[PDB]
Amino acid sequence: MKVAVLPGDGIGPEVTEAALKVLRALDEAEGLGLAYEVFPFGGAAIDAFGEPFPEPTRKGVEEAEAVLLGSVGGPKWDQNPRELRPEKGLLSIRKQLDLFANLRPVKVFESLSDASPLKKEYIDNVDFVIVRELTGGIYFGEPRGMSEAEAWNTERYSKPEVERVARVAFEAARKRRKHVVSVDKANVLEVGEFWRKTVEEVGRGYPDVALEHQYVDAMAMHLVRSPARFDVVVTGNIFGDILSDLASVLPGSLGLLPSASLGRGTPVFEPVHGSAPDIAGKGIANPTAAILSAAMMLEHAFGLVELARKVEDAVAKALLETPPPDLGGSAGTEAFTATVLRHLA
Amino acid sequence: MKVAVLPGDGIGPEVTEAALKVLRALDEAEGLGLAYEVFPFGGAAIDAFGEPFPEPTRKGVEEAEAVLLGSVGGPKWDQNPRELRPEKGLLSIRKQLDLFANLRPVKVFESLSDASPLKKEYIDNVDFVIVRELTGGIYFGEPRGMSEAEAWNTERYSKPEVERVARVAFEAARKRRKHVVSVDKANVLEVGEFWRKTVEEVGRGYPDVALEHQYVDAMAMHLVRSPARFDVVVTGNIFGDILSDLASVLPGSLGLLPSASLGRGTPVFEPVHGSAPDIAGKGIANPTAAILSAAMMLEHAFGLVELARKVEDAVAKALLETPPPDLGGSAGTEAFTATVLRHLA
């Protein structure tokens, strides 16, 4: 199991290391062969190497079997230009490893039910994964323009780009409850008729997984009225991007969520949450999203679905037993990483 | 006050008439000069006149100062072709009266708080109006297409189309709490930079009203986390259409919501909810949305903002005192129309 580890800025060192603490325990216990190496990335490499993704790191993520990415970003850099700022590097590692699908899981852990905005009965048993196409459509599509008179922008997709994110979706489905929902605007737009027939062709090859289709506006209503009804949701870019932010309010007690970019190269896994500079060093950072991005690596990079679920129970249990300060408890990073480990022994 | 009344099919006769019962009471009481006339529209006119919007009605809505529309649609017609089915007429009256903005208000009435999917604290004091541009952008925009290889669709807006829906928004704002939020994707798409500067030019003329901008994905999260923070929201078509369906789950106890199309011609007002054929004649239909579309007519067609708010209190009070069967009470259309009237005497 070869992991290039890029802990990034701010809290990235602290919470990326609590992830590795869970992974070295499973590694010991199951003998998985974890070989990892830490590489420079972000505000720290701007300072050190004079750019956010230096070629040691270009090579490192190019040759590992997984990247464990922390978080970059800091005010310090914003003022200096454009390709010298933490975030540029975030797109450079996406381009290089040819990543085209972004997986975002939302789970509401029975113990933090009361933190959610929805009544308990609507969040019970939410466990779903939205996989959003990453590189196509209206944000990148052309023609585009702006005149004194008007402005234009094209949503455009080719069969290859639809089949790519669709296979990730089905394969992603096989490892959890076997149902895909594709999301489109097929009843009005033709990009969406297209998307619809192609997801349905590709679905033929995955017989063990169920396929259904929904319109973006009906799926926006279902994520608040019945979100426990989905397993994997696959959609385009702007709709994945809108429906993943609406879906991120369902847990409530934010900060807990993991993200993973997948594709031809090396899968990148990271917590959704940035640098949090305010609190780097104090030891209170909540590691729940780094420990769960690790669980996603094990599931998507190495296919060890059964260990990924046992790490997601240890963190569920742990969240119930020792809520971090940010969730009305007092367990900092280490004491929380502890009880996670104390559950998967 | 000249109203062409088009009660439509199914429950349309019943609930459009309870609206008129409230309006004839205010009319008596304030002497507003209500002159109304009932015209044929929908499944009923397909049967009667052999098309859904016959020229008596074309003329009627053309010459009234407001349309009070009920609901059309019935299975009976679906099988016969395309321009002979209830819904066609719905676009024919939109084209004819040159309507380009659709106003959708969401309010959560303190008494039905427990029906909502959100915890009480998030719905308390929701009162906002989304005005969605109706005739432009990606659903109508061109070029568009579909090949074996790819599919395309253009989101396109010209300054005139952005300024139109923006003035409705500001003027709509003046009559309630004076804050507009425009919703766009300005940080990625140029249609959205355009939309953004134009809503900001037009805002210069309305000094008494506050303007703010938000991205569609951040506004999708705000409608569940803090929806009581908006007064009027103005946006384009597909985003109005997505954000109005997400916003329609906040009341919970559905069926209660009013809609209004505005523009160069005669404003059309209608309940959001269709025909409901299952229950036409039984007398149980909930009239809360027809009585509140009437309140919207008074506010937008005749500018009688102060009476519109007193009819929205009578129906609030009434919802508290006699919930309809559909909201765990037993008050049918008439008994509910009663207590509404019994409050605005």
UniProtKB/Swiss-Prot annotation, chains A, B:
Q: What Pfam family is a match for this entry?
A: Iso_dh
Cofactor comment text:
Binds 1 Mg(2+) or Mn(2+) ion per subunit.
Keyword Transport (UniProt): no
Which UniProt keywords are listed? Amino-acid biosynthesis, Branched-chain amino acid biosynthesis, Cytoplasm, Leucine biosynthesis, Magnesium, Manganese, Metal-binding, NAD, Oxidoreductase
**What GO terms fall under cellular component here?**
cytosol
Site (Important for catalysis): residue numbering on this chain: Y139, K185
Q: Which residues bind Mg(2+)?
A: D217, D241, D245
Show the GO MF annotations.
Answer: 3-isopropylmalate dehydrogenase activity; magnesium ion binding; NAD binding
EC number(s): the record gives: 1.1.1.85
Family, similarity comment: Belongs to the isocitrate and isopropylmalate dehydrogenases family. LeuB type 1 subfamily.
Any idea what this protein is called?
A: 3-isopropylmalate dehydrogenase
Q: What is the species listed in this Swiss-Prot or TrEMBL entry? A: Thermus thermophilus (strain ATCC BAA-163 / DSM 7039 / HB27)
